[PDB]
């Protein structure tokens, strides 16, 4: 019935996206490209775009975002990219905290909750 | 069915976001106070404000994530928290140590709630 | 009554599990047994199994998991336990970040969101 789960980008460890009754949970997305906070933030947001598309959602349908930075010194730099990317008038619940990530060179990780668009 | 309402929207985030009975609040950070207890009170008072605005309250919080700058403030935060929570209807909770956007912020609380029917 | 809340393992501070409209929110599960990351992860995951079962769910119906490690040096050791525990083909959205926990001896805390299986 309506609690049925769908899985996207499944690995032995995690799925990139998981969806159930209209809600969408993305794995924490980490940089695949870039060195600077801005470069890495851009790459992470592009991944999010790609995975939200796969789930029948998009950034204008993000409910919540938690942003983990390795170093809170990168706040303004991250924000500059985030601010340009978010859907205006439809910006999500957000929290930003300092936490070290699985690799030392990762400066940002963003964890998204979103909703599947109604047809 | 999956329609979204945004509350207190800024260019960067909204304070509250509702979809299909669920409410997601932004991390609420202190606007008043210096000590962990004073800041926890202020954070919780904001949560109350945004909850009420969204047709919810503290007795309909599902989940709370508490970030402290310093886990040494654990007892101090809890004292304020324990007094505030709706008795018999206390949420899923996790409390972890993480630094916040401003150095003087000792506490940030992130809430998921339900809109009362 | 569509959004009725059910509470499980309610203390004056928190409930171990909270359910509403099919979704399950577990409190951060912390180790009650074990010293090493491996030992503590298993204990944490054993708790999760228990509470998910109490809420009419299981590990194959976990939507999301946030894993906090005291020390990111424990990443491989935790993943070892995680990888064997997770339901193959049904692995959840995951994020792993470094954060100190309530007690210094605690090396892992896992926070789960899941769905109540249909009848």
Coordinates of C-alpha atoms in Angstrom, one line a residue, chain A residues 1-5 7 10-21 23 25-28 68 98-103 109 111, chain C residues 21-23 60-66 68 72 75 79 82-83 86 89-98 113 115-118:
Chain A
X1 CA 0.0 0.0 0.0
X2 CA 0.9 3.7 0.2
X3 CA 3.9 3.2 2.6
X4 CA 5.8 1.4 -0.3
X5 CA 9.4 2.5 -0.5
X7 CA 15.2 3.3 -3.7
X10 CA 21.5 1.9 -4.2
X11 CA 25.0 0.8 -3.0
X12 CA 25.9 -1.9 -0.5
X13 CA 26.1 0.9 2.1
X14 CA 23.4 3.4 1.3
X15 CA 21.0 4.7 -1.3
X16 CA 21.5 8.1 -2.9
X17 CA 17.7 8.6 -2.6
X18 CA 14.8 6.9 -0.9
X19 CA 11.2 7.8 -1.4
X20 CA 8.0 6.8 0.5
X21 CA 4.5 8.4 0.4
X23 CA 8.6 12.2 0.9
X25 CA 15.4 11.5 1.7
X26 CA 18.7 12.1 0.0
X27 CA 22.0 10.6 1.4
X28 CA 24.4 13.4 2.5
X68 CA 27.7 20.4 7.5
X98 CA 30.3 22.5 11.9
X99 CA 31.2 18.8 11.6
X100 CA 34.2 17.0 10.0
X101 CA 33.4 14.8 7.1
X102 CA 34.6 11.3 5.9
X103 CA 37.5 12.8 4.0
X109 CA 28.1 17.9 2.8
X111 CA 21.5 16.4 3.5
Chain C
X21 CA 1.1 9.0 9.6
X22 CA 3.2 6.0 8.8
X23 CA 6.6 7.6 9.6
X60 CA 14.4 -3.1 5.4
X61 CA 12.1 -0.1 5.9
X62 CA 14.5 2.5 7.1
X63 CA 14.3 5.7 5.1
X64 CA 17.2 7.6 6.6
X65 CA 20.1 7.3 8.9
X66 CA 22.4 10.0 10.3
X68 CA 27.6 10.7 14.2
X72 CA 36.1 10.1 12.0
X75 CA 34.8 5.3 9.9
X79 CA 31.1 0.8 8.2
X82 CA 26.9 -1.2 9.2
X83 CA 27.5 -2.9 5.8
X86 CA 21.8 -3.2 6.4
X89 CA 19.0 -3.8 -2.0
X90 CA 17.1 -1.8 0.7
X91 CA 19.9 0.4 2.1
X92 CA 18.7 3.8 3.4
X93 CA 19.7 7.4 2.7
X94 CA 22.9 8.0 4.9
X95 CA 25.1 10.7 6.2
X96 CA 28.1 10.3 8.4
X97 CA 29.7 13.2 10.3
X98 CA 32.1 13.7 13.1
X113 CA 13.7 7.8 10.2
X115 CA 8.2 3.8 7.8
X116 CA 5.6 1.6 9.4
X117 CA 5.0 -1.4 7.0
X118 CA 1.5 -1.8 5.7

